[PDB]
């Protein structure tokens, strides 16, 4: 198992949900994009914004203990509790 758990055990999201996080507005607060962050979990559709505004993606990761958060900016994800940036694989292939 060469994977972060953290990141390994929430989901992904359609590009329906990601389409308006992806307009450049947070879910809380009214920053504007560019530079946007989105909850990762699957489970979980929040729009915050990070330390570059109000790190919202931060407070919100604690509140849910949610340490998945993609910006929509470069479609890339970050892991809180490792304390790093990771990578969601398109294809698993377990079932
Ligand atoms: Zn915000
Ligand atoms: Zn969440
Ligand atoms: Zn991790």
Redesign the pocket.
Known sequence: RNH????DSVGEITKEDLIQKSLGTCQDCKVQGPNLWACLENRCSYVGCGESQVDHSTIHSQETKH?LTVNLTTLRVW?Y??SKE?FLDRKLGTQ
């Open positions: 972060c758990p953290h990141l340490y892991c509790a490792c990771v």
